[PDB]
Amino acid sequence: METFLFTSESVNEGHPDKLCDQISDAVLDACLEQDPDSKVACETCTKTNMVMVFGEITTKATIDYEKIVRDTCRSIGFISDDVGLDADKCKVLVNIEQQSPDIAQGVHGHFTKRPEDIGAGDQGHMFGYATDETPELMPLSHVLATKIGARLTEVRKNGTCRWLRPDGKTQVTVEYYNDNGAMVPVRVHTVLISTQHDETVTNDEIARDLKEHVIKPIIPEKYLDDKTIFHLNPSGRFVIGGPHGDAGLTGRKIIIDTYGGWGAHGGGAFSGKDPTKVDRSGAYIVRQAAKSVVANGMARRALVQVSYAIGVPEPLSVFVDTYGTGLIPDKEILKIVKETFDFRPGMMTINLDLKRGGNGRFQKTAAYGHFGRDDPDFTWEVVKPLKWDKPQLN
Amino acid sequence: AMETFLFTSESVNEGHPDKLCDQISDAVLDACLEQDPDSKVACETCTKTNMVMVFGEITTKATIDYEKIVRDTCRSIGFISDDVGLDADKCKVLVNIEQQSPDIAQGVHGHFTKRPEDIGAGDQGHMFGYATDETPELMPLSHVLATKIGARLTEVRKNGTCRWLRPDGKTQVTVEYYNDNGAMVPVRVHTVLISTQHDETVTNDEIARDLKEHVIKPIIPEKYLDDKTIFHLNPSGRFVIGGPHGDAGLTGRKIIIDTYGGWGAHGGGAFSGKDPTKVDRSGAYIVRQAAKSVVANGMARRALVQVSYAIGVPEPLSVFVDTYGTGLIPDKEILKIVKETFDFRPGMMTINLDLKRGGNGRFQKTAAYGHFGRDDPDFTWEVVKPLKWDKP
Ligand SMILES: C[S@@+](CC[C@H](N)C(=O)[O-])C[C@H]1O[C@@H](n2cnc3c(N)ncnc32)[C@H](O)[C@@H]1O
Ligand SMILES: C[S@@+](CC[C@H](N)C(=O)[O-])C[C@H]1O[C@@H](n2cnc3c(N)ncnc32)[C@H](O)[C@@H]1O
Ligand SMILES: [K+]
Ligand SMILES: [K+]
Ligand SMILES: [Mg+2]
Ligand SMILES: [Mg+2]
Ligand SMILES: [Mg+2]
Ligand SMILES: [Mg+2]
């Protein structure tokens, strides 16, 4: 058994970049709840005692940008200068304008084009990935780092670890075997957690609590052994956190948002964008495509690329690769995927019901990742039946 | 019939508002390293209509005019009027820059007391380096053509060939590829796309003519072009409003365009506005050197290298090498050689690649047209290292 090490990280809801992603998606949800046809490109940035929302929104919604910022900051736990931002005292800056008329005519003819004619809202390329190594058909390295980060938030909010503050990051090194291009986890090599904390707790109590309350409950017993390496607040002190410790921006966690370094990324951020922004509706459809290929048993792993030009509905390219694990040739998987999914932006919006905001639909997507999640609002997680002849059947 | 697949990479030029932000961020870094090479810099930039903000964490002995660095960067790019999407002299410049968290500074560098081999990673994360023999710069052709078409787009605006051009432009190339036992062999350019900002003096037929004869045809090798290549030339039909005026920009929103255009992998960290204790940068720069050295020494046709860190720990938590079945020796041996040849500790990388020297736009030059595949001697991570191996 020749093995290799692969590492992915995560950050929880209180990381200053993820805070911005969550605020950006709070603004989106708010615009859509009132005006489903909202054009939203909402960017957020944060530093000590400052939040700025900026970019382009055309909506009929009545929005107060200041209340959405201050509410999002509050629910996450940023309620004093001690935890790294005070939702009720921080400066909130707004530089939001309507979408360029030049973009609006090409994309959606100023709200006049029919679904099937809606152009991509920008150029770019997006990838979808899926792997049979976990039930959610995601990479184990990403899934553990992410589920450890969610746990880290949960034990802060349920009172299991009262010493926790909101800002935390995780990283997991998984030791893998390649089985004919499929990825088979062997064991967890290294676990890293860095978490903000108050001045009541010793580093021995942090190490103990993280192993017992956060790590052992999330990682399957069979991947943990007495050689697994643990780094637990390795910097030795994490009291100052959130924006007070580090400025955050929307769209600076795009690998954490997706597959943790597995598959590929076309580089587009998701948060604060309505679904004419193919960066988001396009990546979601290619995840649904990649997942459907693995879930139907057509392959053990699959990577799908799509690409767009602004004002053009049809994709410029589509790629399927199954890393040698496909049970039919990759070009027939490409033909089945092209027959089965509509990559036109106006169609993707409707097929995935992405014009619904409210009940934090998108805000929920803006921490703990966009993919591998079971909430029915994650409509791109629903597997589509695919038509093919399985080698094993007559 | 030869089996092929389509792979698409994009680029943006120096007037893209996200890329403007990367070049401001890295202009700040330059100014800081030119006066104080031990400068700790995490300089973030964002921009919208008539507005640039610099923010984040700088500890430097340097005496810096942030406001003049912003304006001079906006000016040399060409944002000199509201008509081209930002005026370097009119716009509001906001600054929310403060000193690095002492909790980070103690753990990372012991407030400037830790020796190089003991220097902590400034953060956790992971970082990928890639190389492929398909071009002479050992970059993927999809990425190279998109990138070099965008740099030509800027060059024909500056040199006065196409006087209707404004600063903000995007490109995208779809390449048709043959898989030759894991090695990537480019067959042809399937689709070329350009969207460029433009004044009111030019017609769409003049744009499409000029973009093909002045911009595309000079850059793309003839052997890759044919009478079936698809060309999307300003497909939105109108691009007069541009720059920050048409789209908010942010530092670190072009990390794929900064790297390998969707080939290899990305750990998700941004480069621009960071000093070298930031393993996001020094980490990705050394794994590029390692990947490039494996391919350039003839050990493989393609190579991916991952490295990972924990904050405050000098040694990486993991390394992986994969050659996609092109390695002439087993990957576990290539890993052994890379570990023996490359020092991944952040204090060591900084000195070995000379990353503590800025000025003369050392980093500002990496903040557009990509950090890899360039032969400027300032790109010390492009220098190939000899590797000791026995060719089978
Ligand atoms: C280490 S900071 C990034 C570097 C920072 N811009 C600087 O000036 O060095 C990145 C993230 O690590 C976490 N972090 C902040 N302070 C930390 C500390 N003292 N120890 C460990 N992790 C910390 C927070 O999640 C923060 O957003
Ligand atoms: C189209 S904008 C992204 C979406 C935008 N935030 C919105 O409100 O729809 C992204 C980039 O496309 C380019 N762009 C801007 N205006 C354009 C136009 N009218 N036609 C084509 N490309 C344009 C610029 O490079 C800009 O930074
Ligand atoms: K930052
Ligand atoms: K934007
Ligand atoms: Mg960040
Ligand atoms: Mg983009
Ligand atoms: Mg952008
Ligand atoms: Mg990072």
Q: How far apart are CA B246 and CA A251, in angstroms?
A: 18
Nearest-angstrom CA–CA distance, A363 and A357: 9
Distance CA A151, CA A157 (A): 10
Chain B residues closer than 8 Å to A190 by CB:
308, 317-318
Is A253 annotated in the active site? Answer: yes
Q: Is B19 left (phi over 0), alpha (psi -120 to 50) or beta?
A: alpha
The answer to whether residue B247 neighbours chain A at the CB level (below 8 Å) is: yes
Pocket of ligand 2 from Cβ distances under 6 Å: A 41, 56, 99-100, 102-103, 106, 121-122, 310; B 16-17, 168, 170, 195, 236, 238-239, 242, 246-247
In this structure, CATH architecture of domain A16-117: 2-Layer Sandwich (3.30)
- Inform me whether the C-beta atom of residue B18 falls under 8 Å from chain A C-beta atoms: no
CA angle at B322 for the pair B320 and B328, rounded to the nearest 5°: 125
B278 is catalytic: yes
Tell me the residue type at A120.
A
Dihedral sign for Cα atoms in the order B150, B152, B158, B164: negative
Cβ–Cβ of A254/B245 closer than 8 Å?
no
Token pair in block for residue A245: 């410790």
Rounded Cα distance, A122 and A108, in Å: 12
Q: Tell me how many degrees the CA angle B124-B127-B129 measures, rounded to the nearest 5.
A: 160
Protein residues placing their CB within 5 Å of the ion ligand 6: A 124, 268
Annotated resolution, angstroms: 2.0
Question: Which chain residues have CB less than 5 Å from ligand 7, an ion?
Answer: B 18, 253
CATH topology for B17-118 is GMP Synthetase; Chain A, domain 3 (3.30.300)
What is the rounded distance in angstroms from the CA atom of residue B178 to the CA atom of residue B114? 50
Are A173 and A189 contacting, i.e. CB atoms less than 8 angstroms apart?
yes
Are B350 and B115 in contact by the 8 Å Cβ rule? The answer is: no
In angstroms, rounded to a whole number, what is the distance separating the alpha carbons of residues A17 and A36? 26
Q: Are B252 and A45 in contact (CB under 8 A)?
A: no
- CA B31, B32, B38, B41 torsion: positive or negative? negative
A15 is catalytic: yes
